[PDB]
Design a protein around this ligand. Sequence first.
Ligand SMILES: O=c1ccn([C@@H]2O[C@H](COP(=O)(O)OP(=O)(O)O)[C@@H](O)[C@H]2O)c(=O)[nH]1
Length: 268
Amino acid sequence: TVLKRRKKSGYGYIPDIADIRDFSYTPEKSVIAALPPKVDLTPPFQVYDQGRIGSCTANALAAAIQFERIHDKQSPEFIPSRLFIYYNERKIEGHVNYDSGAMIRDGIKVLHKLGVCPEKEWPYGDTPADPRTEEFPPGAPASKKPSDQCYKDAQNYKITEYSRVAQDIDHLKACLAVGSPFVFGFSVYNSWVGNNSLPVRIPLPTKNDTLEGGHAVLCVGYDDEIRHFRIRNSWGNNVGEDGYFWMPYEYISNTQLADDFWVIKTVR
Ligand SMILES: O=c1ccn([C@@H]2O[C@H](COP(=O)(O)OP(=O)(O)O)[C@@H](O)[C@H]2O)c(=O)[nH]1
C-alpha cells in the first residue's frame, strides 16, 4: 500500500491550533442590521500565482497587506514578499527545508512581530520540493533565509492587530460591508479542481467527492443575487475570472468545509 502524501503544491493551509486569547472581530450591530445586497472590494492589483509550492497562506496574507496599504493611502504600492512570510511561518510550525504549508495564525504572527519586506527585495521562486525526497532541493528560493536587510525593512510594515471573524454569514458580510477583506482556509474537493476543470462557481461538495487538500484565500465580496462570496485565488489569471472565483454561501458557512476566518489591521 502506498499512503498518499497530502498535496501541498498549489495549496498549503493547515488548520490553526486554537488559542482562547484570539481576539474577536465584533461588527457594529448597526452594520449587521443593514447589510447591502452586494459588496465588491476586488482591488486593482492582479492575482498572484503561487505556483508549485504550499504558500497559499502567504499569498492570501500578502494580498490582505497590499489591499490595506491602498485603503490606508500608503505608498508606494508593492507586492509584499510571499516567501518572506512563508519562510518565517515554517520557523514556527513545519520546517523551512520542506513544503509543509502553514497555519494562517502563524502567517499573521509573522506579520505582527516581523512585518514583511517588498517582494522585489525577496523575490518569489516556486521551485518545488523534490518528489523523491519531498525536501526542497539545494538553492530552492523557498528554503533560503531572507537577508538581514530584508528583516530590517520588513519591520516597517508590521500589522498592529488581528481578530477572528465568526463563521456566520452576516458577520462575514458585515466585515466586507465596512470595506475589510478577510482570509480564511477551506477544504478543496475534486468536484472543483478535478482535471483542472476549475469552474468559476465552486460546487458544493458531496460525500461522493474526494478531499484534495487545504487552501487559503482572501475573500473580497459577496452577491445575494447568486448567494456566493467572491474569492481572490493565487493560481494566476488564466483560471476562474481573472483569477477570481465564487464560493456558495452554504460552502463558506459550513464548519466542516471552511474555518480560520481572520482580519488584519495596521493602525497609525
Ligand atoms: O492583535 C492580536 C494580538 C494578539 N492576539 C492573541 O493573543 C495571543 C498572544 O499574543 P501576543 O502578541 O501578546 O503574544 P506574544 O507572542 O508576545 O507572547 C495570540 O496568540 C492571539 O491569541 C490576537 O488575537 N490578536
